[PDB]
Design a protein around this ligand. Structure first.
Ligand SMILES: CC[C@@H](C(=O)OC)[C@@H]1N=C(c2ccc(Cl)cc2)c2cc(OC)ccc2-n2c(C)nnc21
Ligand code: NI
Length: 112
């Protein structure tokens, strides 16, 4: 009921993060990191729990998320992975911060 409503809120946020409006900074987070393709051969030694928006979308579509907290923990994990792997002055870190600002301000408007 109110839980369903909280998950619709989460799905709305997800759709927004995937939307054209935010694509300039959201695009690195759309799909799983392909470490080989990027020559980032240390990625999976540093990042033990990869996460990306397509995975979040699959989990939402499959009704994997049972509550908003579970959903938010994955979205936040995605940002954390970026903050852990990359130096803090890299462009992709700025992009992550901007996308997380979008996430956090809308997530905060949680139906209650
Ligand atoms: C994973 C390796 C990291 C990188 O490329 O270091 C070699 C990478 N940087 C980037 C990255 C680097 C520079 C810019 Cl301007 C944007 C993204 C990256 C690029 C992608 O292109 C498909 C997908 C994922 C990432 N990404 C995320 C998310 N977190 N770190 C990265
Ligand atoms: Ni959390």
């Amino acid at each position: 009921g109110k839980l369903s409503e909280q998950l619709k809120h989460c799905n709305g946020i997800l759709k927004e993060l995937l939307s054209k409006k935010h694509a300039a900074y959201a695009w690195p987070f759309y799909k799983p990191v392909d470490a080989s393709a990027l020559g980032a051969h240390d990625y999976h030694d540093i990042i033990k729990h990869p996460m990306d928006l397509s995975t979040v979308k699959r989990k939402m579509e499959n009704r994997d998320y049972r509550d908003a907290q579970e959903f938010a923990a994955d979205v936040r994990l995605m940002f954390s992975n970026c903050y852990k792997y990359n130096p803090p002055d890299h462009d992709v870190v700025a992009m992550a911060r901007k996308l997380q600002d979008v996430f956090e301000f809308r997530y905060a408007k949680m139906p209650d």
